């Protein structure tokens with residue numbers, strides 16, 4: 565009840581910044597997450613015994629793959645924590661509660677393969693969910709973990725608040741299917757420019773939370789250069805293993821997933837930063853001005869990739 569979570573002085577200050585890295589000590593990641601819920605939500609959002617058991621079942625259901633693992637989950641929650649702390653008064657008590665849980669759960673039980681490879685392997689998850697295949701599985705794993713005994717952190721919600729919070733978490737997790745991102749940003753662009761964008765229109769909030777989820781999920785491109793470079797090794801380790809598997813089925817992988825195109829990595833980051841990342845944080849800054857540091861850090865890292873191509877590092 566009277567039990568606060570604290571962090572050492574360096575973390576206590578650095579955690580409020582957008583570019584914070586959660587570090588290599590795994591056993592401190594849960595404390596970091598609880599710290600962020602208490603400061604963001606209040607010490608009275610979740611029963612502490614239930615929250616701690618939910619976090620450890622969630623951790624237990626992430627796999628030891630090079631990128632889509634428990635570390636990514638907590639990194640994506642921290643970015644959402646920073647967005648929520650710099651835009652305090654734009655979000656409901658239910659939105660704050662639901663969006664940090666969404667971020668922790670958003671890649672539950674990922675296997676290190678794209679929706680694409682599941683469909684070409686004919687995996688049973690691709691017969692049960694024809695589109696946003698892994699993302700419907702992730703929400704489904706979240707609901708399974710919430711119905712374990714002693715795990716329902718939303719116990720104290722009213723019956724109707726309960727339904728609204730599971731609806732926020734479901735839309736939030738679907739939105740991390742980058743195939744849905746392109747359409748969502750275009751529509752957000754035109755609504756803010758024609759002045760029609762209205763935050764009381766529920767379906768408009770949906771789109772804005774959609775874009776926030778894309779931004780948090782890409783936040784690896786908004787870190788200090790050596791965090792960004794070293795996370796890119798992990799991202800390619802999965803893509804190239806998927807490439808290897810595509811070839812086993814007798815299929816040319818796209819160049820992104822072909823380890824024979826190691827040389828072309830710098831140029832492939834350029835495309836990603838210009839087609840996806842810059843547009844994402846550009847639109848997000850327009851809609852939510854205090855997120856500007858995500859835009860500025862993305863641009864700095866783009867300039868670091870240009871530097872790699874010119875042999876300056």
Ligand SMILES: Cn1nc(N2CCCC2)nc1CCc1nc2ccc3ccccc3n2n1
Nearest residue numbers: 782784785819820825828829832833835836
């Ligand atoms: C288009 N394209 N072509 C290539 N290659 C072709 C030839 C050799 C490289 N690579 C890419 C982009 C790769 C990529 N996809 C993601 C998805 C999420 C993400 C989040 C944080 C940081 C980086 C991230 N990246 N990075």
Ligand SMILES: [Mg+2]
Nearest residue numbers: 670671698740
């Ligand atoms: Mg995902």
Ligand SMILES: [Zn+2]
Nearest residue numbers: 670671740781
């Ligand atoms: Zn993710």
